[PDB]
């Protein structure tokens, strides 16, 4: 549990802000908040994601050490997002998979990937105390 | 309000896990959740931060395009954290300042810097609608 | 309290969808959700507003019998929005005023006007029971 | 999600306030709040609906560009309302139907119609993120 | 906290249902829910009050052993209601006073009296633990 | 829905305070709050019930026009209470029954009766909007 | 936030159950829940305290390693309880004091002592993050 | 129900703080908050547990009169904890058992035991009103 009145905020590179808008808003369903020449800000599942116009995006990507996203308490929200990503043509870096298999902290996961190679991981933990 | 039952999660590089513990837990006051040979997981203001043991941390640091943190609804929480950082000697990348001064989306901001040059930004907006 | 999990939704005419975006998102600070050739959908202070592309908008405007908006429990939210409207040059139909002055159900009010002559009223009641 | 402490408010025309009371209170089950010679105010599912004595109600009606109502997170609340409308003899402008069929934003809908030809739409979205 | 999803309900006698409406809805500001030939039901500060058409109302009134009302956590709500009662001319049985003065369980109190001699008591406790 | 921070308070007669304690605390499971020579106060499902030492209790009782209790949103809470009353030997004035049968506002009900002939009614509505 | 739907529970020795009632309910203002020959159960500030009839209570008391109580977010609750303890003559083991003075985790503290030498500590932290 | 903004705090002896960390953090999954030479503090299911370096731990233990833990409203949380304790090799003083069998206040229970012989009891009540 966390304070519902605060927001987590993250800044990531975007090579092209219109292209970032299509991914995050048009496909992923995030809400567009503020737009400037050099950045767009998003309501990203209730937290704030800011996409900064940048040339410093990763040209090649691997799972570690950078990725972000949402861990859902309710499996329905996780399943809905997976369905939405599949129907809206959103690319998956890694499809539906379990991590830490057989441990109490086992979680279901998928990774989406934005046009600037930022990795989005969405998680569901079978024991909700393991979300940290 | 964001869903208090979910958590945002972020992965960042840590050049040394004990050193990351010293920064995030001992000085910053986050709570330690889980430890593995290759990562530590943290309750970071109610969201999840995971520090991954990695050599791919930035040797040269600039404000953009990557940073993360919390935007506090209650200025007391923002002020408390600044005081904590100052008293406990946590390095600042950028001391207390204003961004978008005089504009509706004006916010107070300070940046901390972790031992692997990850930038933490904490914010307080004068109009709470501008948190996105 | 109203159910925080539901949303009120309203449909109104927009003579031009880009112009409606400029008003509701760029100036008023609402968040853009979904776009179609015939409508845009908005997170309007946490409720849903849908602007429908239409020629059936009022050319001549009077206060009654149609208008909509938000009644804020916290006067700070009301004051912030007024300041936003003023600073960002959003047209007022009626500037800051009182309705039912001296009576238990007295409230502060201002009306904004969108480009298709829809009237937005924002209110604050001195006795919160009088919000209905 | 939205602030449970605020209320959405909407003003609509009513040709006859006693007739509006019978529809909104006696049949629909909304609560009567305040009554004046020229208007009645209602607790309309936790938001505020105000029915203004007016001759400016729509003599002929079509679905667009004006209608209002509630989007329910819990399907049981949607189903209960449908059942209530059928049992209490409330007229339907459009019976139970799906809109945006096959899209992630598909929703179930029905439209009621008040005596002054105001259209009430009630919605349930199969993916709750699509409520905006 | 009490469960916000439940309601307390009380039944009391009313010698005349229209007269009870005038008292509870028009003057006191409660909302009218349902009406039948033998009773009216009310949203009484979020709980349910039902006034039953009856000749068994007390002709002679004393403070004990029967009265009902609301104990407000926030003194502003208590003060607002007193002001409402005074401005709108609602009869008091007992004007603003203190009970258990100087003791930890001290509370401000006033009593209103309905047309069938039911006693309404509203309270505010200086120590919120003493509300039970 | 109602403010979880306030409490409904009701005063009722008790012919004997020890006997009232046995009924409300020992059998019904309410919590004993404060005790004085002339009254006991109770945490009665999160609201406040005060039992006043009195000779003015009803020597003969009928369902109307006085009774009180709790309307539960969750049927499990209603069913649990019924089970508890049966197992703990609490007398029922009226056993499990439906009222307003076939109406949208149909509710399940039972009435318990305290030693001083005060009637407690517990309710569950099949449409939760009908709780007022 | 901790889960408001769960309770912490603690068991402690009581040399005499009536004497424990006098302390926890009559003086401290906790609510009595259940009684058995060998124990009493209490709503202790919303958590459960159970006093077990026992001869294994400490005859000689020191601050460490055993004590319990509540840490209040709102200083008013802390101040109210101190005033209650003082006015009602509840024995203090340690009067109002500061622990970790000048440090970020500074808190106000006082200790009460029950009749079986159990130590109750109540705290208020100047930075609410330091409550853990 | 209890205030989600406060925390219950308990102090218990630990013969060795590293050994206490392994039990409470590594095995039980509690979060490590603050560490000093003489104590560790823990986020223990949202309440605060403090383990004080001490020689005054119980060399022999019995169920009464001292133990602590959490009563879960949701059986899934209780079942998850039991599963975690079994998989992580946490010792049980008493395995899964019912107490107050056949009473309305019947509850399911298990007792874990820490290295310094402190007893942890976790409970689930079949009637949630019986949690006090």
The general outline of chain A is globular
How many beta-strand runs of chain A? 8
Structural class by SSE content of chain A: alpha/beta
Give the radius of gyration of chain A: 15 Å
Q: Please describe the biggest sheet of chain A, giving its number of strands, its sense, and whether it closes into a barrel.
A: 4 strands, mixed
Task: Write structural notes for this entry.
Eight copies of one chain form a homooctamer. Chain A has two helices and eight strands; from the N terminus they run βαββββαβββ. Chain A is α/β, with parallel strands linked by helices and 132 residues long. In chain A, the strands form two sheets. A four-stranded mixed sheet of chain A has the order 1-4-3-2, with helices on one face. In chain A, strands 5-8-7-6 form a four-stranded mixed sheet, covered by helices on one side. The longest helix of chain A is centred in the middle third of the chain and has 13 residues, at 75-87. Chain A is globular, with a radius of gyration of 15 Å. Chain A starts with 6 loop residues before the first strand and ends in a 7-residue tail after the last strand. Chains A, B, C, D, E, F, G, H: It comes from Alicyclobacillus acidocaldarius subsp. acidocaldarius (strain ATCC 27009 / DSM 446 / BCRC 14685 / JCM 5260 / KCTC 1825 / NBRC 15652 / NCIMB 11725 / NRRL B-14509 / 104-IA).
């Amino acid at each position: 549990m966390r304070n519902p009145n605060d927001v987590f905020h993250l800044a990531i590179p975007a090579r092209d802000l219109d292209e970032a808008y299509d991914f995050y808003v048009t496909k992923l369903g995030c809400k567009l908040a503020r737009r400037y020449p050099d950045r767009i800000t998003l309501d990203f599942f209730g937290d704030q994601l800011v996409c900064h116009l940048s040339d410093r995006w990763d040209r090649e990507v691997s799972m570690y050490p950078r990725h972000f996203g949402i861990t859902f308490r309710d499996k329905k929200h996780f399943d809905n997002l997976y369905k939405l990503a599949k129907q809206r043509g959103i690319p998956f870096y890694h499809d539906l998979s379990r991590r830490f298999e057989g441990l109490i902290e086992e979680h279901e996961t998928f990774f989406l990937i934005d046009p600037s190679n930022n990795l989005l991981e969405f998680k569901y933990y079978f024991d909700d105390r393991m979300m940290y």
